[PDB]
Design a protein around this ligand. Structure first.
Ligand code: FEC
Ligand code: FEC
Ligand code: FEC
Ligand code: FEC
Ligand code: FEC
Lengths: 230, 227, 230, 230, 230
């Protein structure tokens, strides 16, 4: 129920990796098998929830893929992250490019606004993830003005019920105030959402929102491993 | 009327690794041409040009502009270029400029030169764009008037073809721009003249720029490189 | 005791390191032995006090661990820092990511505001460290007004007495004005403090506050070295 | 009026290079000879004119030397630049640090303002080169107001007839709007000119003007190559 | 007023280097003797005056030591800087991190304000060096208002006569407008001067003032060399 989801403690991490040319090679059948064994086991221990593994090929220089994983305790993401890097070839041959950490919290004025992953909704086939930093004046602004700006913001999104939002505090978990993730069945709906949301007063209260990471949720880690540069 | 076309457009900018190509490039070239010839036959990814960027900027050397109906088709081609060709193996990705063609806000005959199927220019400049935060909540007929005046400022440059394409959430930018022309100086002069527009008061970012010359085949580009 | 505490000379440095991929390897026993013998040697010399060694796993690309050490004279930190880099393999196989240097001073208006490390408090199990730079107008502002803004800033932290603050001048010891460290028993307390502190007039007088370094205090250097990426 | 000189087509490129420590060694006589041959070859083909080679030792980190060369067609500079890198050991043992490209055009108002290199003046013994970006409002501003401002700007340079300006459009040849190069017999004259030009209304209409490259024109390649780190 | 010291021509460079890990090793006595011979050779040549060599250990990532040297002609510094890098093993195993160049000039209003090094003062045991860039409106402000702001700025330092100032033009000698160095018997007085100088109206007319380089003047090259990482 809706207090329970608001009260829930869940850290969420987007871990973006870059491939190291030369490191992976071209014989990957066992690398694939080992990495799926690693995640299947994660799934079985029941502490870290891998919401998706995303192929970011062609999104940006210096990034190749992303793991989205979630846990009640940050220490459990730290452990999974450390093990991935140490106990799988995939993690050994990849560089950490960027880490987006966040912690679920009740929204300020609308307690029915909850991240897709907290709602337990099926993850979308396509995602864009990016951090966010608000104006300096945003939180100390008169609350009723912020409230109406956020209301208008939400109404501007109503044309996109198929795009699921995740707006999550990120204070002191890195350099940002929020971790944003939008999930959708087609990437053009994510592009068009971002374009439409420019038409809102809330854009007057924005300081940072890059880097973006956009890509395709793989059905299984084979699809990712097999595309990476060797 | 309504040109249907959904198209994604990517500018993939690569940096040559000094000392990686060396002097025996003929197998590298032949392998690279076979990759590109193979893309043409599959018929999903159209390569509008390969560009020599030599001398434009440090840390960039060449650029691939290819276009497809689904972004996953460009991901596969881009991944395949880097994975299965030595040319892709001995280069570094410097920058990726991604976009998705959409209709213009006000004037529905404003269409990118590649969507129109027009001949690619001998010379190209490519760069990203981010408007000021106040731009899209501006009164709509004001923004319409500004964009129309901005368009008029280019009438002396019919030989420069424009490509202004949404890039929201495909990277760090809002628009992907490419101007194609038969001579580089027409591009320099167009950008200079377009500064004399009210639209310039509503800009936040427009770098990095990539400017260079369209080559006829891979051989022409690869023989230029420092390797 | 507040006058002696306010008049004391103490430099504080946060030395943030990253591990060089491929440098540590599997045989790490001499490295740990040599490492703790370095830190034991520091404690017996009695000059440089290690408040904590912290594992920053999961926090950000390009940083893996942090040392927090304190000394009456900066040249003693210089000597300890250089010795770590020069005479330990752990320091030899690590890259310096960032240094946050500071010198304790009395606060401007409230002289009972003192860093936890100066108060001799037990360090917290979790930490976040970040530099701070005020707006150009902050110091030349009317003192009554800056004083009232700072008192409201302090009151906004009223529900986080378990989060211990260290706000320490950093002028001319790097690119910053202040070095901040917040110490707590659980990470979520740190995140929520930062979130609530956004609702303050002080936020209209801020220029820079990144990068952030967040992680967990380890009980000894053994626990750190065996967690690091290989 | 200067109608022919205003109408000529000339691209101008500043190619800045960084020496790779350890790459040259100390047996440089043949590296020099090969480099001299390459510049000999460019004179002979008559398409690319080298106005100067500059020793930038001590100006800034990560640059060591610069070539200023000029051609009617950009592709002639492209070919010669690429050939320097690909077909001489000096270019092979150097990294490109930064490129500043430009294309001469008539001035907006004072058509007697023409680059030193376009006028055919002897190149100065000392040079400073930097790119330039005007404020967003500069070109859409009322022409009468921009004309007044540029008139005051030219007048502020009245005491420096010995410092020769090259103010050359750079739109779409890079990240900048103008390429600036100031040539003089003495470096102090350039420092003093730059200082004096801060006293102009035009400074209220500036957005970017770094990096700077300042250095000493050499007589021949041997003078530069013998300076470089081995 | 101080006409001859105000009239004289001196270029001043701060040359900051970072050690290259792995390069120096543990065999250093002959590296030191050679470097001392190179510095002896400079003093006997009588053109380049080394005011100090500074241990920067622990100040910031990617910097380790600094040379401060001074000469009537900038090509003399260029030659010494290049000879250091090319012909001493210490120069060869070091990377240039940052260069801060400047040219002495008379102050705008107070001709009794002169750099410590121009006045022939013994160098301080501790230094902080940093570049500076004023606001775009600073130089075109009414001169009587800028004069008053600078006089109040000077008065704010009245309590720190022990911290000696060098405020030197840097236009066209890099990316900045001024090169600042503050030298003192004690580091803590430098920190406190910087803090106190925030309480000035001049602070409303600042654009840039980083990177900072802070450290201790060594008596002998051996003192520096023996602390660097191997
Ligand atoms: C996209 C996008 C961005 C980033 C780009 C931009 O700046 O526009 C974006 C930015 C943010 C940011 C920060 C916050 C954090 C709160 C703050 O104080 O900023 C943030 C927070 C909220 N958003 Fe937001 N958003 N957002 C959607 C998409 C985007 N949103 C869609 C879609 C919906 C609608 C679907 C849903 O509610 O789940 C939606 C609604 C809300 C609500 C609920 C509003 C209401 O009361 O109606 C809250 C709270
Ligand atoms: C160059 C250049 C830039 C970037 C530099 C600058 O800011 O000046 C530049 C920037 C943009 C940007 C963003 C947009 C996207 C819409 C927005 O809301 O920004 C953007 C959009 C439009 N542009 Fe634009 N431009 N632009 C041309 C060149 C440049 N344009 C030339 C040439 C023509 C002439 C027509 C053609 O040949 O296609 C032209 C016309 C249009 C029209 C059609 C307007 C009309 O006539 O009603 C639309 C829509
Ligand atoms: C968190 C955080 C930041 C950075 C983020 C932000 O800007 O909100 C933050 C920023 C700063 C900065 C700079 C300064 C330095 C003085 C200045 O002129 O900025 C700075 C200085 C002070 N803080 Fe501060 N803080 N701060 C706390 C947490 C944060 N603080 C908590 C908790 C408490 C309460 C507990 C305690 O005093 O120990 C607290 C109180 C004070 C007091 C005492 C106030 C009083 O008289 O009531 C002074 C002085
Ligand atoms: C130095 C310096 C800078 C960069 C730093 C700053 O912004 O102060 C500097 C910046 C620029 C820039 C961009 C432009 C390009 C036009 C624009 O629209 O900005 C630019 C353009 C002009 N400048 Fe300029 N300058 N500048 C000189 C030095 C500097 N100038 C000296 C010397 C002379 C005088 C000698 C000569 O005519 O050749 C001089 C004169 C002119 C004239 C002719 C004006 C006149 O005399 O009526 C034009 C046009
Ligand atoms: C520290 C510090 C900074 C940088 C931080 C800040 O912005 O406060 C700092 C910044 C600058 C900068 C640029 C300039 C260059 C001129 C300009 O137009 O900015 C610059 C120039 C001057 N400073 Fe300055 N300073 N400064 C001192 C310390 C600092 N100063 C101390 C100490 C004294 C006093 C001792 C002395 O005269 O040498 C002192 C005084 C002067 C005078 C003499 C003023 C007078 O009484 O008429 C001039 C001229």
């Amino acid at each position: 129920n809706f207090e329970e989801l608001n009260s829930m403690q869940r850290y969420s991490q987007f871990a973006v990796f870059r491939a190291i040319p030369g490191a992976l090679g071209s014989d990957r059948a066992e690398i694939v098998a080992q990495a799926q064994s690693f995640f299947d086991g994660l799934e079985t221990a029941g502490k870290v929830e891998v919401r998706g593994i995303y192929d970011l090929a062609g999104c940006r220089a210096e990034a190749d893929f992303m793991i989205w994983w979630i846990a009640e305790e940050f220490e459990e993401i730290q452990a999974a992250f450390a093990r991935f890097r140490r106990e799988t070839v995939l993690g050994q041959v990849s560089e950490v490019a960027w880490l987006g950490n966040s912690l679920h919290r009740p929204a300020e004025f609308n307690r029915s606004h909850l991240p897709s992953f907290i709602m337990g909704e099926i993850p979308g086939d396509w995602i864009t993830v990016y951090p966010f930093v608000r104006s300096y004046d945003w939180y100390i602004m008169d609350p009723q003005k912020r409230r109406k700006i956020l209301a208008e913001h939400g109404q501007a999104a109503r044309d996109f019920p198929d795009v699921r939002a995740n707006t999550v505090p990120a204070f002191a978990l890195g350099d940002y105030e929020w971790m944003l993730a939008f999930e959708a069945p087609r990437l053009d709906r994510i592009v068009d959402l971002m374009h439409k949301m420019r038409y809102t007063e809330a854009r007057l209260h924005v300081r940072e929102e890059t880097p973006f990471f956009t890509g395709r949720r793989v059905s299984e880690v084979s699809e990712l491993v097999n595309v990476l540069p060797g």
